[PDB]
């Protein structure tokens, strides 16, 4: 059968999905996720789209504003819109899978609704590819690959130059925040190779 999705869980509750095509495979993935971590994922969705204040209140307004100020929705949507059918099936199937379980949850809440929804006072809603993609964008991209303190660095350098003078200050900034350090233990050994690129370390853009 091409419409079959078998879900076998192991002795630790870990699910194994079996399916013919792409859409069905990730449908089953989303389905088991909805069963295991619905409350976790819902709050993760709100954390990555900045809608926590909707259910938790005023203490999270600032958090919401900051999340929204750090990404651009049109951009994310356009990327999704550019996905080939096969790639789209990933996001679409995952969303659909979650929706199948969420529909059963809201159909029989007295037995299937995770207690946290009851405690926090709301019910879960349907997911779309955007939502699924945003989980990754927000908990991986925007949070582990979005690091910079360049403005602070310039303030430090500016202070060091005022205290020690121009050349000495520059040289001290290269002492506290060196660009590279040849004694740094590296994952790749020097016998293998080295990075060919050299960089300006005098803030010459000024």
């Amino acid at each position: 059968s091409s419409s079959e999705i078998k879900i076998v869980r192991d002795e630790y509750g870990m699910p194994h999905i079996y399916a013919n095509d792409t859409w069905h495979l990730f449908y089953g993935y989303g389905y088991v996720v909805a069963q295991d971590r619905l409350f976790q994922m819902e709050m993760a969705r709100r954390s990555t789209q900045g809608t926590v204040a909707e259910v938790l209140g005023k203490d999270f307004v600032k958090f919401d504003k900051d999340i929204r100020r750090n990404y651009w929705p049109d951009a994310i949507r356009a990327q999704i819109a550019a996905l080939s059918p096969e790639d789209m099936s990933i996001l679409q199937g995952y969303a659909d899978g979650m929706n199948a379980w969420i529909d059963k949850v809201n159909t029989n809440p007295e037995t299937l609704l995770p207690k946290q929804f009851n405690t926090f006072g709301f019910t879960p809603k349907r997911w779309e590819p955007f939502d699924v993609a945003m989980i990754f964008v927000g908990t991986m991209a925007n949070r582990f690959s979005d690091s910079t303190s360049e403005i602070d660095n310039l303030a430090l350098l500016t202070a060091l130059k005022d205290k020690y003078g121009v050349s000495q200050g520059m040289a001290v900034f290269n002492q506290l925040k060196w660009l590279v350090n040849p004694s740094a233990p590296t994952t790749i050994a020097v016998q293998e190779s080295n990075y060919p690129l050299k960089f300006n370390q005098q803030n010459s853009q000024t």
Binding site: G13, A19, L25, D36, F60, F63, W72, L91, N200
Partner: protein
Amino acid sequence: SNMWVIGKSKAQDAKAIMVNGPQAGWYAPAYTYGIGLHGAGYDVTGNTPFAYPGLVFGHNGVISWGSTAGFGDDVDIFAERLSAEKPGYYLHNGKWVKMLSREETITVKNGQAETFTVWRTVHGNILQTDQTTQTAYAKSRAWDGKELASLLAWTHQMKAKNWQEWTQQAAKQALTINWYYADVNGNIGYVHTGAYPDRQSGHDPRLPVPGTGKWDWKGLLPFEMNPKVYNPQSGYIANWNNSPQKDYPASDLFAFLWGGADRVTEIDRLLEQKPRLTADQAWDVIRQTSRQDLNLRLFLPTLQAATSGLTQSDPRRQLVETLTRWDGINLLNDDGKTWQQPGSAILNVWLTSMLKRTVVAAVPMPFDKWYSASGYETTQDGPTGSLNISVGAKILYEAVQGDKSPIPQAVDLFAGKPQQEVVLAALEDTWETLSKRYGNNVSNWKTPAMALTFRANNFFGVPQAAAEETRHQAEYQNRGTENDMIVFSPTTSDRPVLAWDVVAPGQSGFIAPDGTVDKHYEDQLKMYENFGRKSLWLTKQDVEAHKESQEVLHVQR
């Protein structure tokens, strides 16, 4: 996050071993999600954060993969030129270009809704900080517009069968992440993947650049430039968020440095100590690194030189000798509250004193604050993340190395004072501080141990569970939020591959309306505590023989 891959030349009773420990802090329910995919070209098993379509930690029976954050510099800030006479525009390439903007409304539970605008330029979203009538800063990411490509790359890589098919996917991952490879034949590999900007000549990637146009990136560097290695002659690949490669520049974070003092050495030491390691010995490294004080090895020699001419009746001498005899491996006392040895307490107090006397004294306020932390700071709940050598401590390390350090000491952190003198003075504070708190008998000192907490709030600080769902663990362990190991061609098994992981507190975070907790809600918590682990199945036969439940859905798109 740490990772060590052991190739055929260093694997005992196997051809390759991979052990991964991603460190995102500890949460309940679990940071990652265990899942197995079979069909549509996928045949995989492992676990992944927030249940991404693509598994960050896993294998497919032919190869296995892992990650740790890369922390390369892939983000620059552009200083945009504004005009009061043209609200909403910025100067770029001699023209006033219209910024991108959008309205947002924050609906608030039991409160009034708030509306505001978000602005963006060709360089990136505008920061809500550092704002003037003439300037606004835009945050520029080399990975901008490639988020989905990275997600899809993390997924497609699961289907690779060799180094070439795999690197083809790593080339499409635009975030700054370390990818690792291993296979059934014993090949191992590493790629510091991601998009990195090709910068204008003279661009200091540590400081802002004008947004008027002359400083715009040339484009992105080629994949050829990404640090990578296949089957290193060392026979192993180890990483703990340290530098990928010689001469490779780190993130611009002021508190982030790749220097002579690096915690990854704690792993290289253990892997080189033994010519070959078995799966069990490789797994053991988690236990050892998670308990290893990271500063002992760095400053012990300085402490020994400074006190080498003291009599034994001087307590400062006695403190160093205590460190000399120590392996730096903390163990809990029977009270499940204190450490057997007072080493970390001694190091913490001394180090805190050293930084205040050196680095901190040379940096103008308020920036001095950035270099004062000893790296031991914590709260009752214990560290929210991994433990590391502090930025101030790394800078201090270059200083005590004297000319053995390749970093020119523009200014003497010891300000003309003999290093020994300052080191002895800090040792004096330590004895004073500690002796006054624990008595004068070091052999009976019971210093506080750090504990570990599985928090109810995700790393954003948002509740992902009820508070009551928080879990506690007596012993803090500087290890992965999850640990997984894949072993290829194990000689004691009938399978070409064996794998293990531990997803604590458990696979499920489900609680029924009446409060009935799922059977797999907490069945991996004790296992995490004692460095235990459970098998990951892949083959249909294995999954079948270990089945607990089944279900078959029938649906068409």
